[PDB]
Each structure stands twice: as structure tokens, then as C-alpha cells.
Amino acid sequence: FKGLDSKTFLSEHSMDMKFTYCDDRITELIGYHPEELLGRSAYEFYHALDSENMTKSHQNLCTKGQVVSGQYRMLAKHGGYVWLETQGTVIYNPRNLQPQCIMCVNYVLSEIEK
Amino acid sequence: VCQPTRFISRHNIEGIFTFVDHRCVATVGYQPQELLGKNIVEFCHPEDQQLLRDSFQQVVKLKGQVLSVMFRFRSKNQEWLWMRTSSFTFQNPYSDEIEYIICTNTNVKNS
């Protein structure tokens, strides 16, 4: 059993979902070091069966500014997947509503399953 | 394109830093451990402090939506830098633990 803080990790993305930042809480959860995620798209890590849903989610996030994903599976570093949900929020320029980045709060819902 | 200089932080509802991304060093010159445990208001220009307090007070009322604020933040070199902070609350929905505030802090122009 793990406490709530340990099961959340923050990430930042460019508008195409490439990682620009990840907090170190991800490592104990699913193995990655933050530095190795940078520049990779979140889409590389989504389960095949969640890919179309997560594309729709991302479109909704860009249209609306803030979304909660459905439950989805994220590929772990050493195999298997963990169930996640992610709240996404677009950060803008107020001046001109130009999007700047996506801030994600990711919370696990399972152990690694394989 | 020129990437804006920014870092993420987490705050308790009073404004205390409870998590600071190491990109703070590049943005404002402090190590994370110089921010952690301090109130954000301790870095804010006197003229902007109350605005910043009232922003933190309101963001918990806005149903998780983003509240923005621009303020002057005192860098490690004791210089006022304009920061735009975009803030929203989060709570793990499987819990009733108290909300916290997630901020993205970008150095911006006042022009």
C-alpha cells in the first residue's frame, strides 16, 4: 500500500504531448528517469487500445483548455503497463490566448500489470 | 522558437512552496531548497503581495480552473523579475485530502 503523494506525478508537455518536464515520482512508479522522457511524445507510452481515446482526449484538451482523461494504460520501463488517469490543463498567454504548454497531473490506479 | 524560462511549483493553500522544480535555478536563481517551505509572498514585491495573497485565496473557489497573476519576484540577485504564474487546484478525486495549488511560473515581459 502507498500513500496518495507517492501515486501522483506531475508532467509538463509541449502542445504535441512531448515531455518537457517530469517529476521524479515517476521513477518509483514505472521506472523511467525524467531525463530519458524529455523530447518523447506521451503517445509512445500509451497502450494500443487506449490510443484513439487519448488522441480524442488531447483534442478536447486543446479545444476546451482543461480535461480529465479516461482511465488509460501507460507502458512501464521494464514491461507491463500501469493504469493512470491524467488531468490536463493548457497554460496560455493571456494576451492573445496562444497555448504555451500542457500541465498534467497523473495519478495511478494500479500496480504494474503484465 | 525561444523557449520561455519557467518552472513548476506546488503550494499549500496558504502559499507555502511544497514542491519546486529545479528549473527554478535558471528562472529565478534559487536552489529548490531556498524556496521550499517559504511562502511565495516572501519573494513578491510589496506592491504585488496582496494581489498574490488574494489570488491564492480565490483559486480554490474556481472549481479547478486556471487563475493567472503577474507579479514581481525577487531573484537570487535581489532583482525584480516579472513573473506570470498560472495556478489551479488539484485534489486526488479518490480522496478528501485538502486541495493543493499547482503553479507554472514564467518570466515574462511588462511591455
UniProtKB/Swiss-Prot annotation, chain A:
Name of the protein this chain belongs to: Endothelial PAS domain-containing protein 1
Name of encoding gene: EPAS1
Pathology linked to this chain's protein: Erythrocytosis, familial, 4: An autosomal dominant disorder characterized by elevated serum hemoglobin and hematocrit, and normal platelet and leukocyte counts.
Superkingdom, taxonomy of origin: Eukaryota
Domain PAC: 69-112
Biological source species: Homo sapiens (Human)
Domain called PAS: residue spans: 4-65
The protein's assembly and partners: Interacts with HIF3A. Efficient DNA binding requires dimerization with another bHLH protein. Heterodimerizes with ARNT; heterodimer binds to core DNA sequence 5'-TACGTG-3' within the hypoxia response element (HRE) of target gene promoters. Interacts with CREBBP. Interacts with EGLN1. Interacts with VHL. (Microbial infection) Interacts with Kaposi's sarcoma-associated herpesvirus/HHV-8 protein ORF34; this interaction results in increased stability of EPAS1 and thus activation of its transcriptional activity.
Expression by tissue: Expressed in most tissues, with highest levels in placenta, lung and heart. Selectively expressed in endothelial cells.
Post-translational modification: The hydroxylated prolines promote interaction with VHL, initiating rapid ubiquitination and subsequent proteasomal degradation. Under hypoxia, proline hydroxylation is impaired and ubiquitination is attenuated, resulting in stabilization. Phosphorylated on multiple sites in the CTAD.
Compartment list: Nucleus; Nucleus speckle
Functional description taken from the UniProt entry: Transcription factor involved in the induction of oxygen regulated genes. Heterodimerizes with ARNT; heterodimer binds to core DNA sequence 5'-TACGTG-3' within the hypoxia response element (HRE) of target gene promoters. Regulates the vascular endothelial growth factor (VEGF) expression and seems to be implicated in the development of blood vessels and the tubular system of lung. May also play a role in the formation of the endothelium that gives rise to the blood brain barrier. Potent activator of the Tie-2 tyrosine kinase expression.
Curated annotation (Swiss-Prot), chain B:
Domain of life, source organism: Eukaryota
Domain (PAS): residue spans on this chain: 1-63
Cell compartments where the protein resides: Nucleus
PAC domain location: 68-111
Bilayer-spanning residue ranges: none
Assembly: Monomer. Homodimer only upon binding to a DNA. Efficient DNA binding requires dimerization with another bHLH protein. Interacts with TACC3. Interacts with HIF1A, EPAS1, NPAS1 and NPAS3; forms a heterodimer that binds core DNA sequence 5'-TACGTG-3' within the hypoxia response element (HRE) of target gene promoters. Forms a heterodimer with AHRR, as well as with other bHLH proteins. Interacts with NOCA7. Interacts with TACC3.
Role summary: Required for activity of the AHR. Upon ligand binding, AHR translocates into the nucleus, where it heterodimerizes with ARNT and induces transcription by binding to xenobiotic response elements (XRE). Not required for the ligand-binding subunit to translocate from the cytosol to the nucleus after ligand binding. The complex initiates transcription of genes involved in the regulation of a variety of biological processes, including angiogenesis, hematopoiesis, drug and lipid metabolism, cell motility and immune modulation.
Name the record gives this protein: Aryl hydrocarbon receptor nuclear translocator
Parent-record interval covered: 357 to 467 of 789
